[PDB]
C-alpha cells in the first residue's frame, strides 16, 4: 500500500507561504505553517512508503500529517507506488509522468493507446503533425487517407516532408516517416479524396477519425452526417487564417454534432466568386497549435485519463492576440442531423 | 497603383448582415446594405484594379465606394497589387493579411541569424519552423546525444538517429527541408554562466533547456549585459509557456516583475524534479515561440510575448499572461 512522491512535483517559497505542484494543479497555500507541513509530509514519500511507514518518519503530529497526506493524494502529487513500475528506458516513459499527474496508471493508459486505431483523414499540415504525435505516443494503428501529392509549398507546415519527397504521395511519405520514428506500430494508407458524400463509406471504422482534409468546403458537414449515422467518433482540427481551431470531438450519443448549434441573385454570384478564390493564410505556428491540441484530445479520448477539451466545443486560439474562445456545440434535441 | 483582393478573404451571410474576413480580422457587419456594398466593392478587386477604375466598374455611389474601399484597405482585405508577386507562398498570404509586403518580410528573414540554445523538444520544433520559413542562418547549440526516449516530441529524430548528436541530425534534417539556408552547430551545453560567452551574437536567441534549473537566469543576465534579444519557451508540466521576448532598452527582463530543516527538504524534493513532458504542450510552446521570432525579425506584427510570460493550459480552456514590464528597481537591469 505504498505511495510515492511524483517526480513532477515542485514546491516554492512564494508570498506568505508557498506553492505546491507545477502546472494546472499548482496550489498556493497561504499559511506558512501548513505549507511547511506539506513539505515535511511530501518528503516522507520520496521513497515508496505506506501511510503508516511514512508517518513513522514524520516529526509532525498525526492530524497534520494526515491532512497533508490527503492533500498530496487528491492532487496526485503522491501516487500508488506501482504506478511507477515502468523502466526509465521505456520508449514512452517521458509521457508517463504526464499520465501519473492525472492520477492514471501509465501502464494502463499505454495499453489503451497500443490497442487503438486512428484514421487520419487529410494528410496535409494538420495530419502530418497529429499523426507523428500519435505515432510517437504509441497509438497502435494509424490509417492515413489522402490522394494528394507533395508540392514545394507544402514544406512550411508539412514537417514529415523534405525537398526530395516532392512529386510523391503524401500517404506513402508520412507512412515511411512514422515507421522510421516508431517501428513498433502499424501504419496503413488508403488512396482517397472525399469527392462525394458516398466516398465516406470507403473510410474504415476506428476509435476516432481525425478530420482535417482540404477539399471540399463542406467536408465537415459530410463527415458529421456520416459519422452520426455510422456512430463514428471524430475530431475536426484546422485554422481560419491566423486562428487555430480544434473541435468538436463528436462522441455518438454523448456530445453534440457539428450541425447542432447551427443558427439577391447578383450579390450571391459575387459572394460565390469571392469565396471560390479563397486560400487560407497558412502559417506553421497556427497549424501546429491546432494539430497539437487535436492530438492531445485524441490521446485523452483513447487513453481515458482526462477529459478532452473539445467535447461539445469548437475551440479557437488566436495568434495575433492573447485569446482563446470556445463555440458551444452541445447537443440540440431539435438538431436536424442527430436529433429526434 | 493597382489594388487586389487578398485570397485569404472569406465572406458569409450571417445574422442581420454578414461576416467579412477570416481569422482575427473577421468582422460582423450588422447592416445588410453596408455588407452588400462591401462585397460589391471587393468584387472590383478580384483581379487587380486601380481605385478610379473599380469605381466606374462598381454600381454604388462614390460616397459608399470610398467608405467600403477604406474598410477593405485598412483591414488589409485589399492590398497593393505589387504585394501579390514559390516555396514561401502560404507564408506570403500570412504577411499580406497583416498589411506587409511579403517579399520585404522574406528578405528580413533571409538576412537573419537565430541561435537555438537547446536542441530538445522545443529546439526541434522551433528550428524546423524557422528553417522552412526561410530564416537565413540557424545556429544549433547542444552537446547531447539522441535517446529512444526523445522521440515522443523531438520530431526531427528517428529510431535510426538514436546515439548521434542532436545538432548533427537537426542540421541534416533542416537542410533536407530547406537547402537554401545555412546551419551551424556548436557542441556545447551551458553548465556554467561562463559557457554563455561561447554562444555567438544573433538577431535573437531562442532559449529552451530544461537544465540547469537556473539556465534562464544566467541567460537573462548574460543577454542584458550583451544587449542580446532572446525569447524563452518551455512548459511547467501541462502548461505551455512562452515569453518573455526580451528586447534591450525596450522591454522588462526576466527578473523585472519578480528555517534550517525545511530549506534542506525543499532542496532535496526540487532536485528530484522531472517535468511531466507531453508533446502537445511542447509543440504549443514551440509554435508560439517561433511565431514571435518570425514576427520579431519580420517586423510585420507585434510579437505576443513582448513584456509577457504567457501560459496556455492543456487541461482547461485557458491562456494567462504574466506582466514582465520594466522595473526601475530590477536587480539585473534598470
Amino acid at each position: 500500500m505504498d505511495y510515492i512522491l511524483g517526480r513532477y512535483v515542485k514546491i516554492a517559497r512564494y508570498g506568505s507561504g508557498g506553492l505546491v505542484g507545477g502546472g494546472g494543479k499548482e496550489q498556493y497555500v497561504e499559511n506558512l505553517v501548513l505549507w511547511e507541513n506539506i513539505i515535511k509530509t511530501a518528503y516522507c514519500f520520496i521513497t515508496p512508503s505506506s501511510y503508516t511507514a511514512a508517518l513513522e518518519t514524520a516529526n509532525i503530529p498525526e492530524k497534520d500529517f494526515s491532512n497533508c497526506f490527503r492533500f498530496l493524494k487528491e492532487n496526485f502529487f503522491i501516487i500508488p507506488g506501482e504506478y511507477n513500475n515502468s523502466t526509465e528506458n521505456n520508449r514512452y516513459s517521458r509521457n508517463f509522468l504526464h499520465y501519473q499527474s492525472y492520477g492514471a496508471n501509465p501502464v494502463l493508459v499505454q495499453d489503451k493507446l497500443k490497442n487503438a486505431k486512428v484514421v487520419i483523414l487529410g494528410c496535409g499540415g494538420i495530419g502530418n503533425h497529429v499523426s507523428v504525435i500519435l505515432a510517437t505516443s504509441g497509438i497502435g494503428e494509424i490509417i492515413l487517407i489522402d490522394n494528394d501529392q507533395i508540392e514545394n509549398t507544402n514544406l512550411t507546415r508539412q514537417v514529415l516532408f523534405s525537398e526530395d519527397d516532392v512529386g510523391k504521395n503524401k500517404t506513402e511519405v508520412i507512412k515511411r516517416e512514422l515507421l522510421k520514428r516508431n517501428s513498433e506500430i502499424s501504419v496503413s494508407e488508403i488512396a482517397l479524396n472525399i469527392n462525394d458524400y458516398t466516398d465516406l463509406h470507403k473510410v474504415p471504422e476506428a476509435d476516432i477519425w481525425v478530420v482535417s482534409a482540404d477539399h471540399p468546403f463542406n467536408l465537415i458537414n459530410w463527415v458529421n452526417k456520416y459519422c452520426v449515422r455510422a456512430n463514428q467518433p471524430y475530431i475536426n482540427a484546422g485554422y481560419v487564417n491566423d486562428i487555430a481551431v480544434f473541435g468538436p470531438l463528436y462522441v455518438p450519443g454523448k456530445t453534440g454534432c457539428y450541425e447542432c448549434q447551427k443558427v439577391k441573385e447578383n450579390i450571391d454570384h459575387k459572394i460565390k466568386l469571392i469565396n471560390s478564390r479563397f486560400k487560407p493564410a497558412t502559417f506553421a505556428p497556427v497549424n501546429n497549435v491546432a494539430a497539437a491540441l487535436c492530438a492531445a484530445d485524441v490521446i485523452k479520448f483513447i487513453g481515458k485519463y482526462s477529459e478532452p477539451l473539445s467535447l461539445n466545443k469548437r475551440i479557437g486560439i488566436w495568434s495575433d492576440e492573447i485569446k482563446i474562445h470556445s463555440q458551444n456545440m452541445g447537443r440540440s434535441p431539435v438538431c436536424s442531423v442527430c436529433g429526434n | 497603383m493597382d489594388y487586389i483582393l487578398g485570397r485569404y478573404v472569406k465572406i458569409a451571410r450571417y445574422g442581420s448582415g454578414g461576416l467579412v474576413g477570416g481569422g482575427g480580422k473577421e468582422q460582423y457587419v450588422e447592416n445588410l446594405v453596408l455588407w452588400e456594398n462591401i462585397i460589391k466593392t471587393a468584387y472590383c478587386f478580384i483581379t487587380p484594379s486601380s481605385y478610379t477604375a473599380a469605381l466606374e466598374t462598381a454600381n454604388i455611389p462614390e460616397k459608399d465606394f470610398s467608405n467600403c474601399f477604406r474598410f477593405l484597405k485598412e483591414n488589409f482585405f485589399i492590398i497593393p497589387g505589387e504585394y501579390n508577386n514559390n516555396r514561401y507562398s502560404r507564408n506570403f498570404l500570412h504577411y499580406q493579411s497583416y498589411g506587409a509586403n511579403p517579399v520585404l518580410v522574406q528578405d528580413k528573414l533571409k538576412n537573419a541569424k537565430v541561435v537555438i540554445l537547446g536542441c530538445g523538444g522545443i529546439g526541434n520544433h522551433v528550428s524546423v519552423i524557422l528553417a522552412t520559413s526561410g530564416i537565413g542562418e540557424i545556429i544549433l547549440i547542444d552537446n547531447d546525444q539522441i535517446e529512444n526516449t526523445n522521440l515522443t516530441r523531438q520530431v526531427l529524430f528517428s529510431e535510426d538517429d538514436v546515439g548521434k548528436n542532436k545538432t548533427e541530425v537537426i542540421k541534416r534534417e533542416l537542410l533536407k527541408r530547406n537547402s537554401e539556408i545555412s546551419v551551424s552547430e556548436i557542441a556545447l551545453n551551458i553548465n556554467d554562466y561562463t559557457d554563455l560567452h561561447k554562444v555567438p551574437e544573433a538577431d535573437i536567441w531562442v532559449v529552451s533547456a530544461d537544465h540547469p534549473f537556473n539556465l534562464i537566469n544566467w541567460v537573462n543576465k548574460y543577454c542584458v549585459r550583451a544587449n542580446q534579444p532572446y525569447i524563452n519557451a518551455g512548459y511547467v508540466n501541462d502548461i505551455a509557456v512562452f515569453g518573455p521576448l526580451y528586447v534591450p532598452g525596450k522591454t522588462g527582463c526576466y527578473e523585472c516583475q519578480k528555517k534550517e530543516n525545511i530549506d534542506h527538504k525543499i532542496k532535496l524534493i526540487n532536485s528530484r524534479f522531472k517535468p511531466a513532458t507531453f508533446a502537445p504542450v511542447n509543440n504549443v510552446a514551440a509554435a508560439l515561440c517561433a511565431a514571435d521570432v518570425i514576427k520579431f525579425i519580420g517586423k510585420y506584427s507585434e510579437p505576443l510575448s513582448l513584456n509577457k510570460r504567457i501560459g496556455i493550459w492543456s487541461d482547461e480552456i485557458k491562456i494567462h499572461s504574466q506582466n514582465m514590464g520594466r522595473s526601475p528597481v530590477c536587480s539585473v537591469c534598470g
Binding site: 515542485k10 516554492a12 512564494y14 506553492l19 507545477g22 499548482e26 498556493y28 | 537547446g118 530538445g120 523538444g121 522545443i122 529552451s208 533547456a209 530544461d210 537544465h211 534549473f213 537556473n214 539556465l215 534562464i216 524563452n232 519557451a233 518551455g234 512548459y235 511547467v236 508540466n237 502548461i239 509557456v241 524534479f273 517535468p275 513532458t277 510570460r309 501560459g311 494567462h320 504574466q322
Partner: peptide
C-alpha cells in the same frame, strides 16, 4: 505559471 519553466 507562478513557478519557473522546465527548460
Amino acid at each position: 505559471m507562478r513557478t519557473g519553466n522546465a527548460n
